[PDB]
Amino acid sequence: GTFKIGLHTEFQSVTLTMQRLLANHSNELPSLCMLNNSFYYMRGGVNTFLIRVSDISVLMKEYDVSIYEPEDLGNCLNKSDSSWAIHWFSNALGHDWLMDPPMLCRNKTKKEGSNIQFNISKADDARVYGKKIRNGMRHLFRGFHDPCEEGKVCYLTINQCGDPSSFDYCGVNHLSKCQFDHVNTLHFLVRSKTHLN
Amino acid sequence: GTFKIGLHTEFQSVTLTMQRLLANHSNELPSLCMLNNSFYYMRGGVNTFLIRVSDISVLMKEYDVSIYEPEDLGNCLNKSDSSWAIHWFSNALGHDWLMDPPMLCRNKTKKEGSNIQFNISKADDARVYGKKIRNGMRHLFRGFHDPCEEGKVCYLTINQCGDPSSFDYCGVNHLSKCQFDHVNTLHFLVRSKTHLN
Amino acid sequence: GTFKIGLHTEFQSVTLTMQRLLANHSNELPSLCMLNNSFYYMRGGVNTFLIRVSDISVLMKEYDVSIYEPEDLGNCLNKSDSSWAIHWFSNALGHDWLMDPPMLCRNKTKKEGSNIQFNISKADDARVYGKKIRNGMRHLFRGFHDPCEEGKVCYLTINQCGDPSSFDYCGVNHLSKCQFDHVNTLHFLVRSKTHLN
Amino acid sequence: GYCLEEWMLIAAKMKCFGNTAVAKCNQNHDSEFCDMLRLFDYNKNAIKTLNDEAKKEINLLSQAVNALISDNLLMKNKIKELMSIPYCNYTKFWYVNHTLTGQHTLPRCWLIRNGSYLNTSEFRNDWILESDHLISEMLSKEYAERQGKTPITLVDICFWSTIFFTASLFLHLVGIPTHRHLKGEACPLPHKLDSFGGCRCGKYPRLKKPTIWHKRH
Amino acid sequence: GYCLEEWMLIAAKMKCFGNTAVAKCNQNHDSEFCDMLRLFDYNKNAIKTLNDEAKKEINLLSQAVNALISDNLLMKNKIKELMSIPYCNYTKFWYVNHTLTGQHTLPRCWLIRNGSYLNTSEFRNDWILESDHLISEMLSKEYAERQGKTPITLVDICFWSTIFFTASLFLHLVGIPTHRHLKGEACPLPHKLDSFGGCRCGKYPRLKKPTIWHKRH
Amino acid sequence: GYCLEEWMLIAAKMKCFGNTAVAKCNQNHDSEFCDMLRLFDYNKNAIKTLNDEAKKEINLLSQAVNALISDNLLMKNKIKELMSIPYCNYTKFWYVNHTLTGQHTLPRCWLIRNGSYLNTSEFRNDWILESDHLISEMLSKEYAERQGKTPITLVDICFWSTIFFTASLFLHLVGIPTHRHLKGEACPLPHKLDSFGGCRCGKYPRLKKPTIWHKRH
Amino acid sequence: GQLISFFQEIPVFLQEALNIALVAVSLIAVIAGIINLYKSGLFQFIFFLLLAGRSC
Amino acid sequence: GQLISFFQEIPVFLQEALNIALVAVSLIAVIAGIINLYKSGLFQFIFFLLLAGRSC
Amino acid sequence: GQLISFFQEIPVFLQEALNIALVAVSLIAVIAGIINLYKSGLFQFIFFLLLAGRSC
Ligand SMILES: *[C@@H]1O[C@H](CO)[C@@H](O[C@@H]2O[C@H](CO)[C@@H](O[C@@H]3O[C@H](CO)[C@@H](O)[C@H](O)[C@@H]3O)[C@H](O)[C@H]2NC(C)=O)[C@H](O)[C@H]1NC(C)=O
Ligand SMILES: *[C@@H]1O[C@H](CO)[C@@H](O[C@@H]2O[C@H](CO)[C@@H](O[C@@H]3O[C@H](CO)[C@@H](O)[C@H](O)[C@@H]3O)[C@H](O)[C@H]2NC(C)=O)[C@H](O)[C@H]1NC(C)=O
Ligand SMILES: *[C@@H]1O[C@H](CO)[C@@H](O[C@@H]2O[C@H](CO)[C@@H](O[C@@H]3O[C@H](CO)[C@@H](O)[C@H](O)[C@@H]3O)[C@H](O)[C@H]2NC(C)=O)[C@H](O)[C@H]1NC(C)=O
Ligand SMILES: *[C@@H]1O[C@H](CO)[C@@H](O[C@@H]2O[C@H](CO)[C@@H](O[C@@H]3O[C@H](CO)[C@@H](O)[C@H](O)[C@@H]3O)[C@H](O)[C@H]2NC(C)=O)[C@H](O)[C@H]1NC(C)=O
Ligand SMILES: *[C@@H]1O[C@H](CO)[C@@H](O[C@@H]2O[C@H](CO)[C@@H](O[C@@H]3O[C@H](CO)[C@@H](O)[C@H](O)[C@@H]3O)[C@H](O)[C@H]2NC(C)=O)[C@H](O)[C@H]1NC(C)=O
Ligand SMILES: *[C@@H]1O[C@H](CO)[C@@H](O[C@@H]2O[C@H](CO)[C@@H](O[C@@H]3O[C@H](CO)[C@@H](O)[C@H](O)[C@@H]3O)[C@H](O)[C@H]2NC(C)=O)[C@H](O)[C@H]1NC(C)=O
Ligand SMILES: *[C@@H]1O[C@H](CO)[C@@H](O[C@@H]2O[C@H](CO)[C@@H](O)[C@H](O)[C@H]2NC(C)=O)[C@H](O)[C@H]1NC(C)=O
Ligand SMILES: *[C@@H]1O[C@H](CO)[C@@H](O[C@@H]2O[C@H](CO)[C@@H](O)[C@H](O)[C@H]2NC(C)=O)[C@H](O)[C@H]1NC(C)=O
Ligand SMILES: *[C@@H]1O[C@H](CO)[C@@H](O[C@@H]2O[C@H](CO)[C@@H](O)[C@H](O)[C@H]2NC(C)=O)[C@H](O)[C@H]1NC(C)=O
Ligand SMILES: *[C@@H]1O[C@H](CO)[C@@H](O)[C@H](O)[C@H]1NC(C)=O
Ligand SMILES: *[C@@H]1O[C@H](CO)[C@@H](O)[C@H](O)[C@H]1NC(C)=O
Ligand SMILES: *[C@@H]1O[C@H](CO)[C@@H](O)[C@H](O)[C@H]1NC(C)=O
Ligand SMILES: *[C@@H]1O[C@H](CO)[C@@H](O)[C@H](O)[C@H]1NC(C)=O
Ligand SMILES: *[C@@H]1O[C@H](CO)[C@@H](O)[C@H](O)[C@H]1NC(C)=O
Ligand SMILES: *[C@@H]1O[C@H](CO)[C@@H](O)[C@H](O)[C@H]1NC(C)=O
Ligand SMILES: *[C@@H]1O[C@H](CO)[C@@H](O)[C@H](O)[C@H]1NC(C)=O
Ligand SMILES: *[C@@H]1O[C@H](CO)[C@@H](O)[C@H](O)[C@H]1NC(C)=O
Ligand SMILES: *[C@@H]1O[C@H](CO)[C@@H](O)[C@H](O)[C@H]1NC(C)=O
Ligand SMILES: *[C@@H]1O[C@H](CO)[C@@H](O)[C@H](O)[C@H]1NC(C)=O
Ligand SMILES: *[C@@H]1O[C@H](CO)[C@@H](O)[C@H](O)[C@H]1NC(C)=O
Ligand SMILES: *[C@@H]1O[C@H](CO)[C@@H](O)[C@H](O)[C@H]1NC(C)=O
Ligand SMILES: [Zn+2]
Ligand SMILES: [Zn+2]
Ligand SMILES: [Zn+2]
Ligand SMILES: [Zn+2]
Ligand SMILES: [Zn+2]
Q: Do E23 and E107 fall into the same domain?
């Protein structure tokens, strides 16, 4: 990787890592890694979650629980040890509680597990919250890309890893092969109001 | 405006401008200008507004509809195409709809048209909202020599141009004389909490 | 304090004070001083308050006044001319009354004056309130040491000087021997969101 | 070097600024002209890149104004305006330009008080010192560039070689004695005399007589 | 130069600091002494401007503190305080002063640890290095002042003229041959010999005989 | 100088960077490598001292991340990424190292476009200029060290003394007349004659006769 | 280019004592070197080389 | 004033080898120049000019 | 050490007209100074001192 650049001067490169530091103090700060365009990951402490963006919608607003209070949002958590990671991700994406549209959730009794769903479609009554959520994911996740289509239907999904909603992707598979990006954490711990949020 | 400063060096000056940036991209950042010691103008999108501060008030608190919500304020406009500029100016002055005195308006169907008025008089029960509004207006508009006097009435009036009450001071005949300032935009597009709002 | 470094260079030092700024701009520049681990003073305008941290607080939630509204906070002052000092202390300590358990206080007529208490004990249901108030005091008071211990009870005492509960520690004795720090007032006024609050 | 388009100026045409003067904006967060240039660069990039595609659903301009200009400079100008002392309103910039070489200083604000420009007399010392600094920078740039290409060891070698050569010339003019001559006697060549004036051959006895020094004869 | 009044110091009279020492505060955002000087200067400006009228309805002092004080430096000092390592509490500043010239360094914090000023033995490497940097800065300032007025082209011209003159002196000592001499023959003056040693006059035939060079005679 | 242990590098062991290159980070706030070094140093300090005590209920780690990291650089990189132009993701840094002396430049980002590292042909000018600047800095550091210890006055004294000595040698070769000689007469020694040819002794009348100049004889 | 550029800047340079001293010493050195070369016979050697065996 | 300031700083300047070398070179050059002016007639010429037609 | 480092960097330095000029001037000055010392008699004086009264 080093080639001669002059007579005695030589081109050299060094590669640094911060993923160890992300794990070193894994508490009070998650580690974010993006698998590809439609898949994203989040690891908080000893619990890892999956962030999915796509047009599918397995969860409905009619006969399912909807989340309003910032304290009772633990319904989509089968192992309800702590939903602090989900809460901190939600209020770091720019989402609000006082006057912001709510998000869907699923009963913990069902085997599907956590199925936190957001509505980010570019349509009527959805261009105020969806754009803000996508800006939040742009600021947190480095290489975020929009998979939705203008004037069509598109959603967002958050699922704890190990649940059927996360499928076999989680476990010792995707999160293991995913590399935590420290720029995500650096953008994630700064509160200057000058960012995209 | 160039004169000899030395032997071969010369004194030279360059004049810069931001008209194209503030006109080709009129949306998401209105252009402001101080036309007179008491007359100010706001041009958001494709509609021009008049902002004046004085002691003469035509609005009354007996048979006029008030404004408490940041969403129903669009009713207070005869040509209610878009009052997002009014809303963004209002929440950029530092005014908060939660714990601040409210504002009234004129009926849209009335001949005189829309008339947004603020109470910034230096008197009892008005030295908290008025000072904050005047500080926000000092931040937004470069020059501000307020006419409000202690113990005397003084009001801030916002009038969408085109209304008969706006007089000939609006339209193509006037307004153009005022020079839109980019420093107003610079103090207007930054959220650092270290400003006068 | 001056000694020779080289054959011609001499070590020298200058000591700077900022008491004139704090004294002249009393309303604009509140001054904070620390007596020792458990004692602090706040001097706003022409009135001085006592900030005390102790494990014991002689109050009770049954028959003591609790303050919720940001307007009736002036009750906890025998000479209720102005409680703006307590207002600024509360809003700069990081303590927002909207979604944070309130404080406790004694009656105006009862012969102990203002005894506003923040329950910062490191125990159950107080692992956020106490930590936030501790971070606020650490921000506002340089050299702040916490005598509160985990798994036990501890409180924060506020009392304007001259009250019977203030004891002989107030007056022109300890208040004078305590030295107001300008780092405290520099931290008190900057609003950058990057501080411990 | 850097050039400003026609629409960026008032009552003028396209004007080009030197790279060295513009390069002073790399670490200068206390100059308004650099902030205006950064805003112009951001506008140029946005038109070419962030405007062709219909993906303009993100308000990157606000975040640019947050970071691409110095907010503390804006607040200092606002404080100066509120204290009725001269301030910058980001419209007119003056500089000192060397006509022959084209090297010019970084443009500085034409301060305004009471809503009117200064009359080039209330900041006379400012532009006098700025012209002096321009001359100093022109003279020092050559020194810096020369020191960046010419080693100081080579300069020292040349200087000491010149000193050695001048000393050699001096010893050439004055001359240095090459052999000793006995007092009252002729030149003892080809024989050589020691400090005591004796010879190992035995011709000259070691009488320890005083001796003098003479050059080549 | 820049001076601090009586009320700005403790147990000391009015103190004045040089322009060169305080010139470092123009771009330095990592110095606490510069922040204190900025606060004092802002107060001085406010007294002369924001005191003649009771219109002080604006928190300009707070805005300036948010602007002319480096929040990053203050937060770093707070972190050092909370990490049980020496920090600055903005009260005592030490510097190295050259007694004769009267020009000194920019004052630096006298760190306090355990609520006590570190003795002048834990940062001993700081003030020795600061005095060395002061001497180096004085000499470098002299060099820069020299280079700002004297062109390097003129220095090069002088050096090459001196080299030319020294070479001329050397050739003066050695002497340059003027006209050739034949083997064992006198100089052909006023006639001149070509490369073959002949003469166009016909006196010297072109026999290609070897020739030697001789100086003036 | 500054050293990074093995756990902070990928596919590499512990390596050390020169102090002078790291010293460029003292006032640098537009460099990502400096920010990464600051984060590493903060981690090392926190683990050494703050981690030992169980009072870790205070987020100095975050309060430093938002303080010792320039958010302007992060947001500029984010804007560059959103414009689909190369940006820095704080992973791989490249620099130019002088193999013999062992002193190098401050590492610079290996920019990434389309989520892939740029090949060493798009920023060829970048590392060419980096090598040129490294050579210039190596040559200029010696000049700076010389100027920090050798006075300008001493160099001036040496140069003027050399000029005086060269002029003295020139006057030695050419010779300067020591006394006047009357036209058509012998040497007037030991008497001294003025421009008129007379003297106070009375032997030579003041006839205003022309006189010539002769050297020592 | 450097020489002509320095020539166009003589009046501004000829304001400090050191610059005037440098110009004077440079001119004196050049003049004295020309005199020495003329006195040392280098010009005579050049003249002999140019007209070797062609004129008398 | 520059010479006086330089003389006041000799003890700190005379701590590096190059400074001592420069001082020695300067002193030797000045001494040799004085000798040369003594050995080339500058002193004799000045003495003759000052006492031209006034003494023997 | 300084001389060794400078000699190790000659090819880098010998790419500019001024550097080659300085090297040539230094070499010519050293050579001519050696010649002058040989011609003046320093070498002869050293030889006489080393073999004073020991050879003929
Ligand atoms: C997420 O938000 C999108 C925003 O488009 C919702 O999609 C929209 O859903 C409505 C029914 O709720 C569809 O019918 C429309 O309803 C109203 C009248 O009831 C009116 O806007 C139209 O006339 C139409 O009938 C609408 O077509 C559909 N829009 C698109 C673009 O697909 C979606 O239901 C939300 N999802 C959840 C789970 O809340
Ligand atoms: C910044 O962006 C670059 C470019 O996308 C990322 O470079 C990637 O770095 C990872 C390791 O962190 C490389 O994976 C490694 O590849 C080989 C086998 O292919 C081997 O050394 C390791 O086993 C490992 O799998 C990856 O190839 C590389 N990608 C590219 C396109 O060069 C870099 O990680 C980013 N920085 C972050 C995310 O912090
Ligand atoms: C805008 O707010 C101002 C206060 O800043 C309101 O004006 C105030 O009107 C009341 C009602 O007359 C005055 O209060 C009382 O007035 C009587 C009559 O002189 C006198 O006994 C006392 O002055 C008493 O407080 C008050 O002085 C007056 N303040 C002034 C001078 O501005 C005004 O009504 C508000 N207007 C709207 C449109 O809301
Ligand atoms: C100030 O806050 C502290 C906690 O930070 C409160 O002390 C805690 O009060 C609760 C009340 O439920 C105690 O829980 C119960 O207390 C008793 C004695 O143990 C018993 O009924 C139960 O076993 C249970 O523990 C809790 O123990 C106690 N904690 C400590 C460390 O004493 C305190 O009451 C608050 N004070 C006020 C005036 O609100
Ligand atoms: C910053 O403040 C200065 C001083 O108030 C403003 O200077 C003003 O510049 C405008 C042009 O932008 C000048 O108007 C011009 O006047 C004449 C006569 O009409 C003519 O050249 C043009 O047609 C144009 O109208 C104006 O006179 C001048 N004011 C003063 C007092 O010199 C400047 O505009 C401000 N910068 C802003 C607001 O961005
Ligand atoms: C920064 O921290 C240092 C170290 O704690 C503080 O130094 C303290 O300064 C005060 C005066 O401001 C000193 O008090 C003085 O002590 C003697 C003996 O009484 C006398 O000179 C005066 O009468 C006065 O009382 C105090 O001794 C000194 N403390 C130490 C440990 O040296 C400094 O005040 C702090 N800065 C701020 C702004 O609080
Ligand atoms: C500094 O002054 C020089 C004078 O030559 C300017 O160079 C000329 O600028 C004018 C501007 O109208 C051009 O038309 C000419 O072609 C330029 N001549 C050249 C480049 O030889 C130079 O632009 C000035 N520098 C500034 C304004 O920054
Ligand atoms: C550095 O030291 C010099 C020499 O002592 C100081 O100059 C004197 O400072 C005192 C301070 O009381 C004044 O009264 C004198 O008038 C100054 N001049 C002389 C000639 O004695 C100089 O102020 C010091 N620099 C500082 C303290 O920054
Ligand atoms: C620049 O290159 C030099 C020469 O290779 C490096 O110096 C080596 O540093 C390593 C560090 O582990 C030592 O083990 C070697 O002995 C050194 N070699 C020498 C002195 O010849 C130097 O570290 C490089 N600079 C960097 C990588 O920043
Ligand atoms: C991303 O990777 C997952 C791995 O399970 C795959 O199922 C999915 O199709 C990929 N998405 C894209 C857009 O390639
Ligand atoms: C989840 O299912 C259980 C079991 O039927 C039911 O009691 C509970 O109310 C459900 N929760 C929600 C939030 O619908
Ligand atoms: C303000 O300017 C307008 C411009 O048309 C003018 O009509 C009006 O009288 C001015 N008011 C004052 C008092 O300056
Ligand atoms: C205006 O008057 C009409 C009745 O003529 C009324 O219905 C309407 O509500 C009034 N405007 C507002 C904004 O209340
Ligand atoms: C602190 O100082 C006060 C001064 O009144 C004293 O009463 C108290 O005992 C001291 N110590 C503690 C631990 O509070
Ligand atoms: C204080 O006591 C008085 C009676 O002495 C009572 O009227 C008042 O409400 C009390 N205030 C409180 C409890 O805040
Ligand atoms: C300042 O401008 C005002 C008008 O804005 C004018 O009345 C006043 O005379 C001006 N003051 C000076 C000193 O020129
Ligand atoms: C401004 O300067 C010009 C220079 O021509 C002069 O004529 C004019 O009087 C000056 N104006 C003032 C107000 O001093
Ligand atoms: C710190 O200061 C305290 C109070 O003087 C003292 O008891 C303690 O021994 C000191 N220890 C250290 C580590 O400096
Ligand atoms: C510093 O140490 C010396 C050692 O002799 C001591 O005399 C002096 O008091 C100390 N200074 C302090 C502790 O301020
Ligand atoms: C960039 O990446 C995309 C997505 O993998 C790929 O399709 C494309 O070919 C790449 N190159 C360019 C020039 O867009
Ligand atoms: C990248 O550069 C290397 C240099 O060795 C070259 O071999 C390779 O083909 C390049 N890759 C490209 C141009 O995609
Ligand atoms: Zn002899
Ligand atoms: Zn013999
Ligand atoms: Zn002939
Ligand atoms: Zn004679
Ligand atoms: Zn006589």
A: yes
Classify burial at D112, counting beta carbons within 10 Å of its beta carbon; exposed 0-12, middle 13-18, buried 19 or more: middle
What is d(CA C19, CA B129) in angstroms, rounded to the nearest whole number?
32
Q: Which residues line ligand 4 (CB under 6 A)?
A: C 61, 119, 121, 123, 126, 152-153
Do residues D192 and D135 share a domain?
no
| Ligand 7 pocket test target in D2, D96, D104 with most atoms within 8 Å of CB | D104
Kindly report the protein residue whose alpha carbon is nearest to atom 4 of ligand 9: F99
Which tokens hold the place of G50?
């140019």
In this complex, do D58 and A146 lie within 8 Å of one another by their Cβ atoms? no
D49 with D143, same domain: the answer is yes
Mutation pick from C87, C98, C99, C191 vs chain B, by most beta carbons of B within 10 Å, is: C191
**Which residues on B lie below 8 Å from A192 (Cβ)?**
192
C-alpha D9/C-alpha D156 separation (Å) is 51
Q: What CATH number corresponds to the domain at position E181?
A: 2.20.28.180
Ligand 9 in contact with F99 (CB < 6 A)?
A: yes
**CA atoms of C44 and C86, how far apart (whole Å):** 9
Q: Are residues D23 and D119 in the same domain?
A: yes
Burial (CB count <10 Å: 0-12, 13-18, 19+), residue C78: middle
Residue D78 near residue B196 (C-beta atoms within 8 A): yes
Find tokens 């365009």 and name the residue.
Answer: A37
CA closest to A9 among chain I residues? I12
Distances (CA, A) of A26 to A19, E181, F23, F48: 10, 98, 31, 18
Which residue's CA is minimally distant from atom 10 of ligand 11?
A107
Note if the bond before F107 is cis, omega within 30 degrees.
no
CA of B39 to the centre of ligand 12 (A): 7
The count of domains in chain E is 2
Touching pair H, A by Cβ (3+ pairs < 8 Å): no
Say whether both F92 and F6 belong to one domain: yes
Q: Which domain holds residue E99?
A: 2-146
DSSP secondary structure of C143-160: T------TTS--EEEEEE
Q: How far is CA D180 from CA D194, D212, I43, I47, I53, in A?
A: 8, 6, 15, 12, 10
Contact of B160 with B49, CB cutoff 8 Å: yes
How many A from CA of A182 to the centre of ligand 2? 13
Closest CA to F136 of A6, E144, D28: A6
Per-domain residue ranges of chain B: 30-188
3-state secondary structure of F74: helix
Q: What is the whole-number distance in angstroms between the Cα of residue D117 and the centre of ligand 5?
A: 9
Residue F150 and residue H19 in contact, taking contact as beta carbons nearer than 8 Å: yes
* D129 and D169, same domain (yes or no): no
F26 and F89 share one domain: yes
Contact D183, I9 (CB under 8 A): no
The CA D98 to ligand 7 mean position distance, Å, reads 10
At which residue do the structure tokens 């640094």 appear? Answer: A16
To the nearest 10 degrees (0 to 180), the angle between helices D124-149 and F124-149 is 100
Q: Specify whether F23 is located in the same domain as F71.
A: yes
CB contact under 8 A, E163 and I25: yes
A27 — phi, psi (to 5°)?
A: -90, 150
How far is it, in rounded angstroms, from Cα F99 to Cα D210? Answer: 62
- Examine residue F144 and state whether it is found in any structural domain, yes or no: no
| Structural determination approach | cryo-EM
Q: Distance (Å, rounded) from C-alpha F103 to C-alpha A10?
A: 11
**Residues in the annotated binding site of D for Zn(2+):** 179, 181, 187, 191, 199, 201
Chain F neighbours, 3+ Cβ pairs < 8 A:
A, C, D, E, G, H, I
In a domain, F123, yes or no: no
